[PDB]
Amino acid sequence: GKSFCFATANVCLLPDSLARVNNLFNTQARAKEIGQRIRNGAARPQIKIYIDSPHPDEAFDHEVSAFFPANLDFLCLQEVFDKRAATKLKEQLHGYFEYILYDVGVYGCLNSGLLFASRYPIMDVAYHCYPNKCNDDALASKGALFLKVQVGSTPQDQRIVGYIACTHLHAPQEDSAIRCGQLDLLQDWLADFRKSTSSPEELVAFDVVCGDFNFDNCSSDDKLEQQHSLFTHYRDPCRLGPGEEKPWAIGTLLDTNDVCTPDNLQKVLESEEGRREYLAFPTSKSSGQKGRKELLKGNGRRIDYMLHAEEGLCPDWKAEVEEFSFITQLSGLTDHLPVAMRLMVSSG
Ligand SMILES: [Ca+2]
Secondary structure: OEEEEEEEEEEEEOOOOOOOOOOOOOHHHHHHHHHHHHHHHHHOOOOOOOOOOOOOOOOOEEEEEOOOOOOOOEEEEEEEOOHHHHHHHHHHHOOOOOEEEEOHHHHOOOOOOOEEEEOOOEEEEEEEEOOOOOOOOOOOOOEEEEEEEEEEEOOOOOEEEEEEEEEEOOOOOOOHHHHHHHHHHHHHHHHHHHHHOOOOOEEEEEEEEEEEOOOOOOOHHHHHHHOOOHHHHEEOOOEEEOOEEOOOOOOOEEOOOOOOOHHHHHHHHOOHHHHHHHEOOOEEOOOOEEOOHHHOOOOOOOOEEEEEEOOOOOOOEEEEEEEEEEEOOOOOOOOEOOEEEEEEEEEO
16 A cells, blocks of 8 residues: 655744743754754654564554654644744755645735645645634734645546645633634535545545644543544544543643753653653643642643544545654754654555
């Protein structure tokens, strides 16, 4: 079969006027470094020795990786706001990705923060902004970007295509109903885009959704979003059910409260104690702070998602998860862990 590799990352590239003060390095410097690390991870495979009994607790390989996956095909970034930093980032990503889209609001202020990079041609693109009537006080726009990509051809001259969507949802922790309204719209727009670009014959290899959803799969506060119908149609490889994580799933928001290299963070996040200290956990309501280490449960708030549809694909092909990874390659450069997924598309 053919393998396709996706990654999502919130890279926190704000304008210097709004970013943390008293920094020796600006947003442009971090952006260049993020772009170089992504390129270097994607371009160079890590040593892969033979494994005789691979992933015995799951249907696919899963890990906390110090690198972006080699042979990455599609990259969805959020919070790419600073234009000069976005330029540095594009210059660096260009060494690996042939098709880069930024300023995506034009396909709907250019303040979505979304960037998409692809090794495969982009056939169609749509951007939709989530409604936010706020007396014109929003500094950024939250929204969803929809892509259709050309990924090959069959021996019968049928075009092989794939669908990708990336989004950044409403952030305030108490605003559960607003995120459910946004997920309702994301569901509607995914179907609208599929219909508008469906109209050579085409075979669908995959249909992926990713992004910074700003809700976890472990706290009672996010219970309504966890139960949303989107998860019925777009499968979350880290989930056993609403509010129930698989044992190997970890949080993706770092606790922002010192040289920590990708290898160091990897080792830290492979331990329960390191996760309790480095990752965000649901805040205790009586103190308004992260609960004492010994009382924390699970592996942290996972708010960055990487999902795949099982329905709607070519009936003759099995598109399944091959690998799922939480990435530490941007340690010190952003407050989220990038998430990646490889899908193996096979016949027979
Ligand atoms: Ca942020």
